[PDB]
């Protein structure tokens, strides 16, 4: 139940952030909506830094890392929204941007995870 | 925030029994456009057909000579908030 | 935009909670492609596909409910960051085959589920 | 739920000054194994090195002949709940 509050507090903060950023910026570039991209790049970065940080601090409370990973990053990031954006592009016959969106999200999110991990490991 | 309705709907070319129409795409992901046409002032069934989202022109054939037609274009489009929905129409009149 | 905020939080908290339960339950069963994380993304893919089709046909449905289902439930339920860290770990472990496979199964799988949800409801109505 | 500790740690081959050890991987994503070794007798400094996660054997060189060594292996592993963390060790004794 203490663990449930971590997921809900973290998740609600993340979901709220995703909502604000997406409704703000997605309509600016419809072929690859940048609000949805930024939230995934940002969660990629955060969880990368979490990866490195929590390794070096083995005794940190499981409540905080549950709040950051399952909660914040889990709420902030999204797969379903990419799925529906891409599906729509596919229905629209816009295959180039369908493919590009998938690649930019995957490669971009992995680069951000790597960058967050390596900045913190190179910092220690 | 952003209009899903096309702009500058116009007849670019015409014969007595057909019309080539074009429009400017709205700044949203259009999955398809729906073209409607029928005789102005009613008294005839309105017909419609779709064109793919990539296209921004359409041909309407099998019309009658010297008759006023009401022609409309709307989109079926993806946006973040509403997923798939239909825009309002843009509408012109044109006499063959 | 406060009624709208409750939709995101109620939907999101339900989705996040579901993802937590399913992932902690099933992820350790197959570590090369953790199935809890996959199922939540396949499930959200399915739900939003059916939402796509359903909302189109019901234009007058309250924006509160579709905000709760899409941004809330599907947004909370699905995850990209968890895939990113699973794949990153596989890459660090030198397990490139399953790194690539995980990316492909998540992407193709989620799109198939979105398509299936959309087409079941359009073929139904 | 699932053990991140390796099993069946053993010396598969030996010379007077080296040991080839092997172990069975645990059923989790191991990023790397950490091998430690030191003289069982007294307080010689324990040394350690990593091996990649794909490997499940390691060579320990530069040992002294006829001396008992304590050898341990633990993992740095990815799981869902704890992200990257370190397992408990598995441990054997072996006399060169
Ligand atoms: C990548 C992993 C696999 C995931 C699964 C994805 C499933 C893809 C669904 C595609 O949906 C179809 O796309 C066609 C083309 O995009 C559309 O055709 C429309 O557009 C065509 C050309 O643009 C025309 O020829 C058609 O007549 C016209 O209906 C058609 O309506 C639509 O249902
Ligand atoms: C898809 C495009 C975007 C991708 C984003 C970037 C992600 C790449 C992560 C790379 O991480 C490295 O992975 C190596 C293994 O793959 C590890 O090498 C380890 O394992 C090797 C063999 O498995 C040994 O040769 C090395 O010495 C040993 O350090 C190395 O430590 C680790 O930092
Ligand atoms: C030009 C100046 C650059 C900045 C200088 C920093 C150099 C040392 C820290 C970075 O090391 C990288 O990342 C891992 C460490 O973070 C190393 O993997 C090593 O350590 C890992 C655990 O930390 C193990 O998994 C691997 O097996 C083992 O090779 C890996 O080889 C190396 O690429
Ligand atoms: F999804
Ligand atoms: F991400
Ligand atoms: Na999410």
Residue numbers in the entry:
A (entry chain A): 2 to 125
B (entry chain D), D (entry chain C): 1 to 96
C (entry chain B): 1 to 125
Task: List passages from the publication reporting this PDB structure.
Bacterial Fluc channels assemble as dimers of small subunits (120–130 residues, 4 transmembrane helices) arranged in antiparallel transmembrane topology. The hourglass-shaped channel is complexed with two 'monobody' crystallization chaperones, which plug each of the wide vestibules facing the two aqueous solutions.
Moreover, the F− coordination shells are completed by conserved phenylalanine residues interacting edge-on with the bound anions, Phe80 associated with the F1− pair and Phe83 with the F2− pair. These four aromatic side chains adopt a striking side-to-face 'Phe-box' arrangement that supports an unusual aromatic-halide coordination motif proposed to be essential for F−-specific binding and permeation. Mutation of the conserved Phe-box residues in a Fluc homologue from B. pertussis was previously shown to severely inhibit F− transport, an effect presumed to reflect the replacement of F−-friendly binding sites in the conduction pathways with kinetic barriers to ion movement. This idea is now tested in Ec2, where we here examine occupancy of the F−-binding sites by solving crystal structures of Phe-box mutants F80I and F83I and assessing their transport function. Substitution of each aromatic side chain by Ile specifically extinguishes the corresponding pair of F− densities, one in each pore, while leaving the other pair Phe-coordinated and unperturbed. The mutations cause only local structural disturbances such as alternate rotamers at nearby sidechains Ser84 and Ser110 (Cα rmsd 0.4 Å, 0.2 Å for F80I, F83I). Functionally, the mutations are dramatic, reducing F− flux in reconstituted liposomes to undetectable levels, a >104-fold rate inhibition compared to the wildtype (WT) channel. Moreover, the F80I / F80I and F83I / F83I double mutants with identical Phe substitutions in both domains - mimics of the mutant homodimers above - are likewise inactive. However, the Phe-mutant crystal structures here, while validating F− coordination by the aromatic rings, refute the idea of a mutually stabilizing quartet, since the two Phe side chains remaining in each Ile substitution, though distant from each other, adopt identical orientations and crystallographic order as in the full Phe-box of WT (side chain rmsd 0.2 Å upon backbone alignment). The results also highlight the importance of the conserved Phe-box residues in crafting coordination spheres for which F− ions are willing to shed their extensive aqueous hydration shells and enter the water-depleted confines of the ion-conduction pathway.
